[PDB]
Amino acid sequence: THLQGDGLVVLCYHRVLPSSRYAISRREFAQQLDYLRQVGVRFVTPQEAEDYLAGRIHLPGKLVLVTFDDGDLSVYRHAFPVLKKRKIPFLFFVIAGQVGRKWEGFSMCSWEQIKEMVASGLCVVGLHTYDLHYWDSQAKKPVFLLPGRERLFAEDTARGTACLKEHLGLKTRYFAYPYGFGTPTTDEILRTQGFSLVFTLRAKVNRPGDAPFVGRVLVTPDSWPQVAAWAQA
Ligand SMILES: [Cl-]
Ligand SMILES: [Zn+2]
Numbered sequence: 001t002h003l004q005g006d007g008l009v010v011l012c013y014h015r016v017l018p019s020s021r022y023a024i025s026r027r028e029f030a031q032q033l034d035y036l037r038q039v040g041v042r043f044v045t046p047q048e049a050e051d052y053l054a055g056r057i058h059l060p061g062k063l064v065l066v067t068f069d070d071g072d073l074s075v076y077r078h079a080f081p082v083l084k085k086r087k088i089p090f091l092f093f094v095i096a097g098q099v100g101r102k103w104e105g106f107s108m109c110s111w112e113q114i115k116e117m118v119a120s121g122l123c124v125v126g127l128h129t130y131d132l133h134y135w136d137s138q139a140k141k142p143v144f145l146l147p148g149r150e151r152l153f154a155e156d157t158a159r160g161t162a163c164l165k166e167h168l169g170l171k172t173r174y175f176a177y178p179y180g181f182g183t184p185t186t187d188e189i190l191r192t193q194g195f196s197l198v199f200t201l202r203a204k205v206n207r208p209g210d211a212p213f214v215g216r217v218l219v220t221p222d223s224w225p226q227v228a229a230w231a232q233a
């Protein structure tokens with residue numbers, strides 16, 4: 001996690017929970033947001049981020065976009081009140097086919113709960129596949145990057161966008177790769193299906209002219225000092 005200079009850093013959170021893996025505590029989460037704001041970081045909307053990275057609106061200074069991956073209930077139960085009380089926008093990348101279910105041991109937000117967050121004007125929902133968030137340990141890569149799977153990826157993506165449109169009544173501009181990475185083949189499928197931004201877990205400071213690709217910092221105990229130092233600097 002190497003971060004220097006003015007530009008857009010995009011944070012990737014998953015769960016806001018007290019005892020789980022890939023989770024940050026409610027208290028710690030709020031303290032992180034507070035610290036960033038305290039030292040002068042500007043929190044940006046997904047639309048602002050797109051116009052910034054596309055250099056279509058113009059700059060300046062130190063920018064941050066908050067994002068969450070998967071659809072965990074804790075985003076509604078614990079993250080959302082923190083965000084709402086601070087009026088901080090965020091992008092929620094959901095596994096559209098796992099919404100309203102238990103997924104890998106965790107309750108997911110329901111559609112009612114996602115809708116309520118969208119209604120606040122703070123939450124924009126993106127797609128995190130429909131139901132292709134699976135890892136192949138034999139091949140050491142995600143199922144959607146396995147050979148001969150480009151068709152399956154295209155169909156899943158189209159299903160995901162259709163599903164979000166049906167529930168939220170909105171075209172889906174934003175996509176996040178499960179496990180953080182794609183190929184030129186999958187990038188192109190996303191482009192032709194109308195996505196304006198494609199988010200990865202490449203930890204970098206994003207600058208105007210980087211669109212459509214956005215590097216995100218996965219927030220961990222080890223990566224936070226780097227973001228905080230970058231912010232304070
Ligand atoms: Cl929860
Ligand atoms: Zn994920």
